[PDB]
Structure 1
Amino acid sequence: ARVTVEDCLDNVDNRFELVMLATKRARQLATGGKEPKVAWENDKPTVVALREIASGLVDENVVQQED
């Protein structure tokens, strides 16, 4: 329910590529071409993007195929 980046920081231990991944996910959400996986909880696309990053549902190859 809250913004938690620890679920990705303890998984990938990188803190660099998830910014670009959530960037591309938020751009695909704001462009209106890709639907979000997790439902909206009265948030902006940033929270949905970081939740899809921390849940491990979208990756680099998945975002490249979605582009």
Structure 2
Amino acid sequence: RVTVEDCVEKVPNRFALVLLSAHRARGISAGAALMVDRDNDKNPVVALREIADDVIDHEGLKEHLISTL
């Protein structure tokens, strides 16, 4: 229900956005979504909508998740 125009404007890579939204959805699966309401939306769409009004430099947690074994 939301275009990828603002998402590409926030992050011009167009490839890191997919991984960022996937990590945001995996985090919103349990105890999250305190920034934007659901509004009858699923996890990926709500994550993409929240990315338009959220910090884009949140890949630190994604990098630290696979930092060690």
Count how many residue pairs are aligned between Structure 1 and Structure 2: 62
Aligned residue for 1:21? 20
- Give the CA RMSD over aligned residues: 2.2
Aligned residue for 2:44? 46
Query: Between Structure 1 and Structure 2, whose CA radius of gyration is higher?
Result: 2
How far does the alpha carbon of each residue in 1:17-64 deviate from its partner, in whole angstroms, 9 at most, with x for none?
Answer: 11010010001111x13x211011111111110011122x13333761
Normalising by structure 2, report the TM-score.
0.71
Residue 13 (structure 1) shift: 1.6
Please tell me the residue identity of whatever aligns with 1:61.
Answer: H
Which runs of no fewer than 5 residues in structure 1 stay unpaired? Answer: none
Normalising by structure 1, report the TM-score.
0.73
Q: Identity, % of aligned pairs? A: 50
Asked which structure has the greater RCO (Cα within 8 Å, sep 6+), the reply is: 1
Which runs of no fewer than 5 residues in structure 2 stay unpaired? Answer: none
